[PDB]
Each structure stands twice: as C-alpha cells, then as structure tokens.
Amino acid sequence: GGPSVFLFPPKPKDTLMISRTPEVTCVVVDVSHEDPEVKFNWYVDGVEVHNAKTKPREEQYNSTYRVVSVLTVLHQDWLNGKEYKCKVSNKALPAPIEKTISKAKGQPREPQVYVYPPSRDELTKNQVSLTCLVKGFYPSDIAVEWESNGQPENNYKTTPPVLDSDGSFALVSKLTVDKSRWQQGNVFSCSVMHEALHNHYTQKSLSLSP
Amino acid sequence: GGPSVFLFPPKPKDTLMISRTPEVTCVVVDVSHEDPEVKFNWYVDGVEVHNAKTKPREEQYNSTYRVVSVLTVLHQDWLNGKEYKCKVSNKALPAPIEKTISKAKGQPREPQVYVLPPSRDELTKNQVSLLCLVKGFYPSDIAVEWESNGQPENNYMTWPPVLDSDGSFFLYSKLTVDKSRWQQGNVFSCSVMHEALHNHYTQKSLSLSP
Numbered sequence: 001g002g003p004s005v006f007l008f009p010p011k012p013k014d015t016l017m018i019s020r021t022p023e024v025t026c027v028v029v030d031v032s033h034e035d036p037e038v039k040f041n042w043y044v045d046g047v048e049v050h051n052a053k054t055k056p057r058e059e060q061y062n063s064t065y066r067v068v069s070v071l072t073v074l075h076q077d078w079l080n081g082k083e084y085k086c087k088v089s090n091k092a093l094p095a096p097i098e099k100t101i102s103k104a105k106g107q108p109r110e111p112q113v114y115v116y117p118p119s120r121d122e123l124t125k126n127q128v129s130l131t132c133l134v135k136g137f138y139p140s141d142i143a144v145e146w147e148s149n150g151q152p153e154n155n156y157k158t159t160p161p162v163l164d165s166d167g168s169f170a171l172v173s174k175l176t177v178d179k180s181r182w183q184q185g186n187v188f189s190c191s192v193m194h195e196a197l198h199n200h201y202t203q204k205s206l207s208l209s210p
Numbered sequence: 211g212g213p214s215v216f217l218f219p220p221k222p223k224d225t226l227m228i229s230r231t232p233e234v235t236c237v238v239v240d241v242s243h244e245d246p247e248v249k250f251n252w253y254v255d256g257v258e259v260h261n262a263k264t265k266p267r268e269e270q271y272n273s274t275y276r277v278v279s280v281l282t283v284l285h286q287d288w289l290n291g292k293e294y295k296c297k298v299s300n301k302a303l304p305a306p307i308e309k310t311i312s313k314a315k316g317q318p319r320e321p322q323v324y325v326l327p328p329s330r331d332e333l334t335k336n337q338v339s340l341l342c343l344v345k346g347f348y349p350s351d352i353a354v355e356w357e358s359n360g361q362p363e364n365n366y367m368t369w370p371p372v373l374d375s376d377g378s379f380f381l382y383s384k385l386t387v388d389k390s391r392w393q394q395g396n397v398f399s400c401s402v403m404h405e406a407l408h409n410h411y412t413q414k415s416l417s418l419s420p
C-alpha cells in the first residue's frame with residue numbers, strides 16, 4: 001500500500017526531431033489526503049538535475065490524488081542511453097521508491113522503407129489502400145506518418161512493430177484514400193523517423209502515373 | 211486454499227475448417243495428494259453433455275496434480291455462439307468452480323483480401339516481401355497462411371489484427387522470398403480463413419509480371 005509511481009519515456013518523434021520537446025514523465029498515484037506530501041528528485045546517470053516541473057496534486061474519482069513531475073531531456077542524452085531516475089518520497093513511504101528508465105537497448109539497424117500502391121482488385125471500391133512497409137529496424141521505437149501536399153494525411157492505421165525472422169522489427173502502415181484522389185494523380189508519401197536513419201528521417205512517395 | 215481452473219477455447223482455424231477438430235479444454239492445476247478426485251461437469255448452453263475426454267491426473271514438479279478434460283465442440287455450435295461451461299469439483303474447494311467461454315460477439319463482417327507484389331525499390335535485395343492485406347473483418351478471429359507449389363511457406367510473419375476506424379479489423383501478413391524465386395515466376399498464395407467468408411476460405415495469388 002501507499003502511493004505508487006510509474007515512469008514513462010518520451011515519445012519517439014520527440015526524441016528524434018530536433019525542434020520537438022522530449023520529456024520523461026514521473027507519475028505518482030494513490031497519494032493521500034491525509035499525507036499528500038510528495039517530493040521529487042531527478043537524476044541523469046546518477047547526477048541530480050533541477051529543471052523538472054512538478055504539477056499540483058490532483059484528486060482522482062477514487063479519492064486519491066495523482067502527482068506528476070515532467071523532466072524535459074536533451075535529445076542527445078536520451079539517444080545516447082543516459083539513465084533517468086525519478087525519486088519519490090512520501091510520508092506513507094518508509095523508503096523512497098526509485099524507478100529508472102532509458103532508451104530501448106540494442107545496436108541500431110536502419111529501417112528499409114517501401115511503399116505499395118493499391119491492388120488492382122481494390123480499385124472497384126470507393127476507397128483504396130496505400131501501404132507502407134518498414135522493416136529491418138532496431139530497436140523498435142519509431143514514428144510513421146503520412147501526408148499529401150505538405151498536409152498531414154492522418155487517415156491511417158499502423159501495426160505496432162513485431163519481430164521478423166532475422167531479429168529485426170517490421171511494421172506496416174495503411175493509409176486509406178479516395179480512389180478519385182488516387183485517380184486524380186495526387187502524390188502520397190510515407191514519413192519514417194528512426195534513430196538509425198540519417199537525419200533520423202526518410203520519406204518515400206507514390207502516385208498514379210498520368 | 212483451492213485448486214484453480216482455466217478454460218481454453220478452440221483454435222479459430224479448427225472451428226472454421228470442417229476437416230479439423232475444435233476443442234474446449236478445461237485445465238485444473240494445484241490439486242493436492244490428500245484430495246485428488248476431480249470430477250468435471252460440462253454444460254453447453256446449460257444442457258449437460260457427457261462426451262468429454264478426461265486425462266489421468268499427472269504429477270507436477272511442485273508435487274501437485276494437473277488434470278485436463280477435453281470437450282470436442284461442433285463447429286457450428288461454436289460459430290453460433292453457444293456457451294461452454296466446465297464445472298470442476300474438488301474437496302479443497304469451498305464449492306465447485308465454474309468457467310464458461312464462448313466465441314467473440316458482434317455482427318460478422320467479410321474479410322477483403324488483397325495481395326501486393328514487392329515494390330520495385332526492393333528487388334535490389336537478397337530477399338523480398340510480398341504482402342497480403344486483409345481488412346474489414348469482424349470478429350478478429352482469423353487464420354492466414356501462405357503456400358506455393360503445393361507446399362506451405364516457412365518464411366512469413368503476420369501482425370495482430372488492428373482495429374480500423376470503421377469498427378472492423380484489418381491485418382497484414384508478410385511473406386519473404388528470395389528474389390530468384392520471385393524472378394523465376396513462381397506463384398505465391400495467401401489463404402485466409404474467417405467465418406464470414408463463403409466456405410470460410412479465400413485465396414489470392416500473385417507472381418512476377420515481366
């Protein structure tokens with residue numbers, strides 16, 4: 001019993017793309033009204049930082065509070081495997097609970113990215129399926145998104161990555177588009193962001209030839 | 211105290227192909243030497259049935275008994291949503307344990323099956339990928355396989371069903387083949403089994419087009 005703590009990594013797009021803002025998130029739940037006092041300490045490979053921000057306690061429908069501290073990280077430190085430990089001390093806690101987290105381990109492997117046009121068979125339908133295969137990648141942390149004419153084309157689902165027969169990961173993203181738009185000759189591109197890619201980024205395109 | 215029961219359903223493929231035998235399996239573990247008699251009572255939509263096969267108890271390395279009862283189900287009973295209950299009595303229980311399982315609920319929707327050849331970009335590799343897209347199905351229970359030349363294929367992986375925006379599921383399977391085989395004109399076939407297909411089965415084939 002007493003309060004519990006969960007420790008969450010940044011989003012992979014946030015670590016990979018230099019303008020974005022990667023954060024590690026330390027969540028405290030089951031904080032009591034009678035002992036609501038929660039202090040956070042943060043450490044990066046065992047050294048303390050003070051740039052974190054702790055949110056005010058928040059009451060849950062279950063009568064306990066939720067406490068959070070968000071610690072923005074340097075993209076480089078996360079990608080280099082630096083260790084992030086959040087320390088939670090609370091009256092109800094005879095001993096501090098410490099969770100640590102860091103990037104997924106393993107030697108990087110550059111994803112191979114392919115796009116696939118719609119089946120001949122599928123053209124009978126009001127919509128068509130553009131397919132993006134990403135395989136050979138390691139670790140599994142990855143972001144895959146679609147767009148057309150610079151604009152997010154968000155009408156898509158993606159398999160979570162799963163292990164292939166050579167020990168790497170693969171996944172497939174499916175964007176659904178109007179056959180007409182496909183027929184209108186519009187270009188669609190698959191965007192892939194992964195630590196192994198140069199610039200962390202590659203985009204592959206397809207369209208119907210005039 | 212108490213021994214515990216776990217009740218497992220049949221494999222979807224076994225419920226779909228008439229040549230196969232679908233089974234509901236009731237597994238009682240953590241039974242003791244002092245109270246070893248286990249009796250099963252099986253009900254299908256509440257009507258007791260008498261045809262299950264029970265196996266002799268077998269001692270586990272924790273010095274407990276494992277006792278498994280196998281009930282053959284009729285394909286169409288399962289597909290029609292019948293409820294199978296296994297009841298297990300033992301003297302170390304405050305009373306019998308009951309467990310009931312049945313097929314996933316929801317209006318079934320017919321899979322749509324597409325096959326896509328490898329992208330021209332991939333042909334410059336030692337192995338290639340052929341994709342099988344199966345979408346718009348419901349429930350998620352499904353079996354997908356690949357063969358060629360009258361042999362099944364050994365080199366595929368199939369991602370879990372993904373819930374699509376329209377409430378249905380889709381999934382992909384990826385068959386990897388040496389480019390030579392592909393370039394040699396060999397035919398590859400994706401076979402999909404699902405309750406909402408006529409005959410519970412469809413197959414789509416592709417080959418290299420010169």
Ligand SMILES: *[C@@H]1O[C@H](CO[C@@H]2O[C@@H](C)[C@@H](O)[C@@H](O)[C@@H]2O)[C@@H](O[C@@H]2O[C@H](CO)[C@@H](O[C@@H]3O[C@H](CO[C@H]4O[C@H](CO)[C@@H](O)[C@H](O)[C@@H]4O[C@@H]4O[C@H](CO)[C@@H](O[C@@H]5O[C@H](CO)[C@H](O)[C@H](O)[C@H]5O)[C@H](O)[C@H]4NC(C)=O)[C@@H](O)[C@H](O)[C@@H]3O)[C@H](O)[C@H]2NC(C)=O)[C@H](O)[C@H]1NC(C)=O
Nearest residue numbers: 216218219220221232233234235237239240270271272274
């Ligand atoms: C004492 O020991 C027992 C037995 O354990 C064994 O012996 C001990 C000494 C050790 O050596 C162990 O390493 C060894 O396993 C132990 O029993 C276990 O108890 C725990 C709970 O406390 C059970 O845990 C549950 O497991 C559920 C999932 O179990 C399935 O998957 C696991 C692998 O993840 C298998 O090990 C299980 O056997 C079971 O496998 C499933 O089995 C069914 C029925 O046979 C298969 O379905 C049927 O398949 C056939 C074809 O084969 C047809 O398709 C049929 O139509 C179909 O019905 C099914 O395919 C298979 N699945 C897989 C993935 O293989 C889980 O859901 C629960 O939430 C829970 O975790 C555990 O199962 C159980 N082990 C058993 C029975 O072997 C005791 O706990 C120990 N006691 C103490 C006090 O220590």
Ligand SMILES: *[C@@H]1O[C@H](CO[C@@H]2O[C@@H](C)[C@@H](O)[C@@H](O)[C@@H]2O)[C@@H](O)[C@H](O)[C@H]1NC(C)=O
Nearest residue numbers: 004028029030059060061062063064065066
């Ligand atoms: C108390 O609630 C915490 C927050 O859980 C979230 O909101 C609660 C009320 C539920 O609605 C749940 O759906 C959400 O995940 C939990 O993390 C915590 O474990 C809960 N504590 C207890 C003792 O139940």
